[PDB]
Amino acid sequence: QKTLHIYNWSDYIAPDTVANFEKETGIKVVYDVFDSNEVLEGKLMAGSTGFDLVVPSASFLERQLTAGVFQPLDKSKLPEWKNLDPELLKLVAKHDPDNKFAMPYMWATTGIGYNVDKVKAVLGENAPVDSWDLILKPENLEKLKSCGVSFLDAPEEVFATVLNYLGKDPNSTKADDYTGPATDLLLKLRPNIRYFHSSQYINDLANGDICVAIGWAGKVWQASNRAKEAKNGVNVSFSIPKEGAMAFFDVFAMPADAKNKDEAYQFLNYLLRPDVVAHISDHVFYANANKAATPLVSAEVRENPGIYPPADVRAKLFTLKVQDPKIDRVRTRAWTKVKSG
Ligand SMILES: COCCOC[C@H](C)N
Ligand SMILES: COCCOC[C@H](C)N
């Protein structure tokens, strides 16, 4: 009896993906979920994960490669690799040289999810929902405080976002940028922030418990879809702000101690099927990295520029670089100071 252990982001797969793979291959898949790059990186660094496939963000995989926690993907076992978008493969190759270790799965941006009616009730019809001013300007957050503010629990994404908003290098290597202006702004906003979390804002946006959130595009679009299905009158939307935003690329990778390698390769080839990953995008509201799958994606997802952004928007996006030990320590210490309590 063949088995396969998969550790993937939560809400990152169609409800029937695994069942169809199981019935076609006869493999029993053990499936578990996470919502934090930090949780996954911690597991990879502390010892055996017990998984055959894991799905870190590409900028995190770059750090993890130097620890040897993955084994390189045998491209002769991934024949439809050519389905992947070349330009996106080129971009991930900055994190994963020669695309030796990482199979791009989905990608999206870290933007602003918001209740349309609540935000407009508080900040007016012309609320700057096109700008990080909506949530990074203290005077706006003080008014939104009453209706609920949520920051994502991803310190590298938040600090890069703040640095870009402050006109500085999103991957600044100047320590004073973090301890000074970045911390200053985050400490002004902190009293208005209800909580830091990477998943709860989905349901809180859907049910109307919060009105604004720094979050990932697909997660916010899922909340907007759940509110629509519940017919609760809640109107959630997502914004890639005009000042730019962080893009991320989540990639499948194979731990160096994976037990069921053959099964894991069968699962990766299953995900390379254009119809397979297009069907996933239809349910999770994330853009996949498969260029052959794009015309198979539903028009609701494919034509949403908050999911498949056009060249105008993509040119203003930035990606995370891996910081040195000093900046990493200073950023981690400031995050702790910000999440205090
Ligand atoms: C064609 O998709 C990949 C384009 O991403 C460009 C980055 C987000 N700046
Ligand atoms: C000590 O248990 C955790 C309690 O957290 C809330 C306070 C504000 N830190």
Residue numbers in the entry: 29 to 369
Please share excerpts from the published article on this structure.
Here, we present a fluorescence-based, genetically encoded AGM biosensor, consisting of an AGM binding-domain derived from the putrescine periplasmic binding-protein (PBP) PotF from *E. coli* fused to a super-folder circularly permuted GFP (sfcpGFP). In the sensor the large conformational change of the PBP upon ligand binding is transmitted to the fluorescent protein by altering the chromophore environment and thus triggering a change in signal. We chose PotF due to its promiscuous binding of biogenic amines characterized in prior studies. Previously, we identified AGM as a natural ligand (K_D_ = 0.22 µM) for the periplasmic binding-protein PotF.
Additionally, we aimed to generate a non-binding control sensor to validate that changes in fluorescence are solely triggered by ligand binding. To achieve this, we introduced the mutation D247K strategically located in the first responding region of the protein to ligand encounter. By introducing a lysine at this position, we masked the primary amine binding-site in PotF generating a sensor that is incapable of binding any of the tested polyamines. The control receptor module PotF-D247K showed no apparent binding to all tested polyamines in ITC ([Fig figs3]). Furthermore, the crystal structure confirmed that the amine of the newly introduced lysine 247 occupies the primary amine binding-site of the PotF pocket and, thereby, blocks ligand binding as expected ([Fig fig2]). The D247K mutation occupies the primary amine binding site, where typically all characterized ligands of PotF bind in the same fashion. The crystal structure displays a nearly fully closed conformation which could explain the good signal of the control sensor. For the control sensor, only a small increase in fluorescence intensity at very high AGM concentrations was observable in the dose-response measurements, which corresponds to a K_D_ of 3.6 mM ([Fig fig3], [Table tbls3]).
